[PDB]
């Protein structure tokens, strides 16, 4: 296994950790704030996923400072992970095209 496929795997594992920790911390941050909906773990996890994927339906979102800071970490982890996968795919294709051209 080369570097790019290693970093991609690591980013995927790390993303899973961020989703789980993010769901836990979001509930912890949002409870205590009147009107907050991000307050139970199952839907918090669903919120984490759609935050990391950038979909953001808007059915759930943080209203507190720390809940929003947690969200930012989830967003960045998502953008970085999927960005790291795209870069890895590009490296794979560049290398294969390099061999195909006999260089």
């Amino acid at each position: 296994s080369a570097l790019h496929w290693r970093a991609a795997g690591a980013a995927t594992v790390l993303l899973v950790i961020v989703l789980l920790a993010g769901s836990y911390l979001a509930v912890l941050a949002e409870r205590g704030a009147p009107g907050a909906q991000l307050i139970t773990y199952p839907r918090a996890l669903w919120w984490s996923v759609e935050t990391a994927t950038g979909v953001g339906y808007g059915d759930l979102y943080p209203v507190t400072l720390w809940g929003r800071l947690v969200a930012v970490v989830v967003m960045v982890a998502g953008i970085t992970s999927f960005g790291l996968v795209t870069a890895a795919l590009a490296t794979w294709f560049v290398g294969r095209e390099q061999e195909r051209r006999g260089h």
């Epitope: 509930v27 912890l28 009147p34 907050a36 307050i39 139970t40 773990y41 199952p42």
Partner: antibody, heavy 118, light 108 residues
């Protein structure tokens, strides 16, 4: 086995303070919240506050005067509620309940009847 | 905060008859409502979670329905042990809140 164990009763003098206990058993998770509910005779259920033992953070009902302070001990799996400066208005049954972080109170304690009197 | 209205406060029914408790939320809360039973001198007891999901150990005659703002707890053929107070509770928005409660009476 009884998941939540509370003392039967507590007698408190007007102005004094009392710490109610709630010893938990059964399955315990990091996502567990312990809630406290106040019920006056003839009246309904009134939410007081919550605490997450795995982190120690507590939240309280903003609609009522804060006379409670929630703490927890992970070593003995026991939740505590510190009621301070009590009047006859504070005389009620105080239940503790366990929520698995999914919104509902799966199990309740037997309740601690608190009487404020001289 | 979310207000839960339970009306009527008292429901009189004949034995074996179907009864329905109503719970109305001050705003839309999907299906995040839960039902509890409290008999005389007893502690509350979970009957239905998430509006309609049954609980292990609870008789099949207990059921729930509704979504949004209007929720209903139903009892098929009320018997004597069903005499109690019935509370609804929401978990959609912080803080959790309880309804005022409905008492069930049996006309024997």
């Amino acid at each position: 086995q009884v998941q939540l164990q509370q003392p039967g009763a507590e007698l408190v003098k007007p102005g004094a303070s009392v710490k109610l206990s709630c010893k938990a058993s059964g399955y315990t998770f990091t996502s567990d919240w312990i809630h406290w509910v106040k019920q006056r005779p003839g009246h309904g259920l009134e939410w007081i506050g919550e605490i997450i033992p795995s982190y120690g953070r507590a939240n309280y009902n903003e609609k009522i005067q804060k006379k409670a302070t929630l703490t927890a001990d992970k070593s003995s799996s026991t939740a505590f509620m510190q009621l301070s400066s009590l009047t006859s208005e504070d005389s009620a049954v105080y239940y503790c309940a366990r929520e698995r972080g999914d919104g509902y109170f799966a199990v309740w304690g037997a309740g601690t009847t608190v009487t404020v009197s001289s | 905060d979310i207000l839960l209205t339970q009306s009527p406060a008292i429901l009189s029914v004949s034995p074996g008859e179907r009864v329905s408790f109503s719970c109305r939320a001050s705003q839309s809360i999907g299906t995040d409502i839960h039902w509890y039973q409290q008999r005389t001198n007893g502690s509350p007891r979970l009957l239905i979670k998430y509006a309609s999901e049954s609980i292990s150990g609870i008789p099949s005659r207990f059921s729930g329905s509704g979504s949004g703002t209007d929720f209903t707890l139903s009892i098929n053929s009320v018997e004597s042990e069903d005499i109690a107070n019935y509370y609804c509770q929401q978990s959609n928005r912080w803080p959790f809140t309880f309804g005022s409660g409905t008492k069930l009476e049996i006309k024997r």
